[PDB]
A paper describes a structure:
Whole-cell currents recorded from human embryonic kidney (HEK) 293 cells expressing M817VEM or ΔMEM receptors revealed large nondesensitizing currents and the ΔMEM receptors were constitutively active. The conformations of GluN1 in the pre-M1 region are identical in both primed and open structures, consistent with GNE-4123 stabilizing an expanded outer gating ring at the upper leaflet of the membrane and lowering the energy required to break the M3 helix. However, expansion of this outer gating ring is apparently insufficient to fully overcome the barrier to opening the pore, as our GNE-bound M817VEM construct was captured in a primed, closed-pore conformation. Therefore, we used the M817VEM structure as our reference. In the primed state, all four M3 helices are straight, and the passage of ions is prevented by three constrictions near the extracellular side of the membrane. We refer to these constrictions as the T3 and A7 gates within the SYTANLAAF motif and the VIVI gate located just above this sequence, at GluN1 V656 and GluN2A I654.
Canonical N-methyl-d-aspartate receptors (NMDARs) are glutamate-gated glycine-dependent ion channels abundant in the central nervous system. Their activation results in excitatory currents that underlie synaptic plasticity, cognitive integration, and memory formation. Each heterodimer consists of an obligatory GluN1 subunit plus a homologous GluN2 or GluN3 subunit, such that functional receptors comprise two GluN1 and two GluN2/3 subunits. By comparison with previously determined structures and together with our results from kinetic modeling of fully liganded receptors, we propose that the gating reaction of GluN1/GluN2A NMDARs involves at a minimum these three conformations, referred to here as: primed (closed-pore, all M3 helices straight), engaged (closed-pore, only GluN2 M3 helices bent), and open (open-pore, all four M3 helices bent).
Author numbering:
A (entry chain C): 580 to 586, 601 to 675
B (entry chain A): 435 to 586, 601 to 800, 806 to 840
C (entry chain D): 540 to 579, 599 to 803, 809 to 843
D (entry chain B): 785 to 833
The structure:
Amino acid sequence: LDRFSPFLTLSSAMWFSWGVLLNSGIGEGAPRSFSARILGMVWAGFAMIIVASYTANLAAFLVLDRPEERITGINDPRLRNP
Amino acid sequence: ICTGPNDTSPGSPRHTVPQCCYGFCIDLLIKLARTMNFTYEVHLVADGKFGTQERVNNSNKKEWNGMMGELLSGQADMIVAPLTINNERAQYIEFSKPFKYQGLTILVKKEIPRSTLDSFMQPFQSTLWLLVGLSVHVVAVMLYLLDRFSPFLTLSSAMWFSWGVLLNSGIGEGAPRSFSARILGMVWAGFAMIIVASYTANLAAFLVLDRPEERITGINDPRLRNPSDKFIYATVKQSSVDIYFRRQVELSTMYRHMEKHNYESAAEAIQAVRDNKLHAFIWDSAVLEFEASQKCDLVTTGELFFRSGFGIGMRKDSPWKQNVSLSILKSHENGFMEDLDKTWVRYQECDSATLTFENMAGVFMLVAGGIVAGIFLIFIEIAYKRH
Amino acid sequence: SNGTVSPSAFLEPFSASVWVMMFVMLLIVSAIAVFVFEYFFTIGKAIWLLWGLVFNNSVPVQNPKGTTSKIMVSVWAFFAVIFLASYTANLAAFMIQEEFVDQVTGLSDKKFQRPHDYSPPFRFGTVPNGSTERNIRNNYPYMHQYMTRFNQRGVEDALVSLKTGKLDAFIYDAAVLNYKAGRDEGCKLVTIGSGYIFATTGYGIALQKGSPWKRQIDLALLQFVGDGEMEELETLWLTGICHNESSQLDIDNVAGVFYMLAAAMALSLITFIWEHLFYW
Amino acid sequence: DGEMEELETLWLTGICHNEKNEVMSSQLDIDNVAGVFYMLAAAMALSLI
Ligand SMILES: *[C@@H]1O[C@H](CO)[C@@H](O[C@@H]2O[C@H](CO)[C@@H](O)[C@H](O)[C@H]2NC(C)=O)[C@H](O)[C@H]1NC(C)=O
Ligand SMILES: *[C@@H]1O[C@H](CO)[C@@H](O[C@@H]2O[C@H](CO)[C@@H](O)[C@H](O)[C@H]2NC(C)=O)[C@H](O)[C@H]1NC(C)=O
Ligand SMILES: *[C@@H]1O[C@H](CO)[C@@H](O)[C@H](O)[C@H]1NC(C)=O
Ligand SMILES: *[C@@H]1O[C@H](CO)[C@@H](O)[C@H](O)[C@H]1NC(C)=O
Ligand SMILES: *[C@@H]1O[C@H](CO)[C@@H](O)[C@H](O)[C@H]1NC(C)=O
């Protein structure tokens, strides 16, 4: 889109996308086309969604990590059925 | 066409008014009359109480009252009602096969969540907010305090940089210059991230596991076990639930609460529960479940207990018993009672998404307040420009 | 079922009306508010700046030159960070929420009613010489005729057939099936309708016609059920470990986000083409 | 024969024996954040020095 714009190389676009995925803040990859900028904006919103989902899923994974299932004495269901 | 007392309230003349009755029991009786042909004359009992063995003011006499007082005295020939079967009722009259299996349970008014205006700032204490604000102001001023006297950043620039770095926005594009200011800015950015991460974590903790009163664990609930003044829980006076509560010995302390508060009929009890006058209503599972289906703001939560069935009773000896039992069993066998359950019990409107608009309308209110205060801010800026 | 139904992603966290309202009208009003502050520089640039600072950090855009506009964008960014934190917390809570599914509900389902009009024939049956078979024959003769092909021998045979997969459904007494499901390991077997019961009958103690023991037996049973012995007997015998009690999410859970992004760059491409034709 | 446990959980039992059954959702106090506050104060002091 920038190359075919009516009025940033491939590596610069790649680094723009990578800085979108992870919030390094390097920037320096501002696109010149209107559609390019709006797509970068929406892709940054989607990257926020992805990283937020990552954080939420990691939290859900690490809040419950109990495979031991400690025996609750003689009242444990496993005792009833050996 | 069913004749009944006009006023349920005691102390009023109970004129026999010919209302019309319909529903589950009426349709069942019509089906029974269609099976074996017999003309029926339906009437309501004078007293709304179901009927229990009660010691009248005249001593040395046990008397049956209510609809069973009607039936045993010869004033009735057959009863069709959601009547719970128990030992006392089985002693004096014979019951047919149950037409609806159910049990006792607890109905409570559902506590709808309430969202306050300070939901967004709820996780942090007001003292914490004041402390972090004062820290923000003092560090923001001392940025340019240190930077100004550096031969090797101004008020507005340092202020906006502070807000941007604490705010994850970047409003202040001016940057610190001295090495001490650089280290200070990095540490302040780290502290800002720590604050925002802890605040997100506290939102996560507060939002989840949000239930002020978990549930009632049937009758074995310790809060239900111990009577209290605030926890006012009741049931219909002089009914099967009262007999079950009285007869079984261990539950008798619960019975001590019963006589303190009772209601004449189920309608009054459910109205009191809706009006928050009662904390819990003990009643049959079918009736309470249907009410919860209809009254969508009330929920049945107690574990099902005292399993029994509604039965249609008659006198001690009656030629109908074998035949009516056979017919009702046949109706159970085929697809008839299912049709009644679908068309009189099953249908419902709501029985019961997170973070709705009403949940944190405070954030939108704050944005609107900022919008409407922007005119005041620009007026102040213009006035400052005048000076 | 192998995979239980997954509750919808990013629909429960925020209401759709909230979605559209705080993605359209609040932004439009704030853009009009900030443009007049900047004027006293461009509507589009202010809109892009505010939209960029809505979600998170991006490539720096020219900052407003008015102090009141800076105050406005700061108080917006406060709402932005609370939006991010709330969007993390609500997905966390939705991960915490459980999930369940039922393959079929009720006996009047078309799968049972007409097993023929399906590419795989539906496998259901029951042990003969029982009350369930007689009830099925008396109510639906076609169901009995169809199930005679997929007949069973015993309860354990039916359970192992369901476990292996030779049979899909097993109709039998509600109490026996409930007990088997409760005692079953792994809880791979479940009742339809969450305890749905059709015949709603009971177990009775048969007696000779006119037997003198009928009245005494009935009175004893009523006394036992009124004194609650049925309750602890049921807990001792009929209690099941399965009843009365999502570590990771796959690609399909977030597939809606990916498809929305797909439509997003599709719209971006068509906007690019439209701009080129408009310039032409 | 096990009657003792039943009798003590019918008579000797209490309501305060849950001991691990409260959600206890709460906020963050001043002293909890005082640690990072003191770290920030030390950072300011070392910046000055
Ligand atoms: C209960 O139903 C049975 C079954 O129909 C009735 O028994 C029949 O009654 C008719 C008329 O009285 C006789 O002609 C038949 O010979 C009877 N058959 C049998 C097998 O007994 C019985 O009369 C019904 N009883 C009541 C009280 O309704
Ligand atoms: C249901 O009843 C039928 C009828 O008795 C049983 O069929 C019998 O099965 C045994 C063993 O296979 C044979 O020896 C008999 O000759 C069969 N009798 C008839 C009349 O066919 C059938 O096995 C029973 N099914 C169950 C599950 O009990
Ligand atoms: C029953 O009572 C209501 C109000 O208490 C009254 O309007 C009505 O007329 C009464 N019924 C008859 C038959 O009078
Ligand atoms: C209906 O009633 C008549 C007498 O009124 C009786 O002879 C007959 O057996 C009843 N049942 C029918 C017609 O099915
Ligand atoms: C998954 O489905 C298969 C049949 O395709 C079945 O045999 C198995 O029990 C199911 N569950 C698991 C955990 O494999």
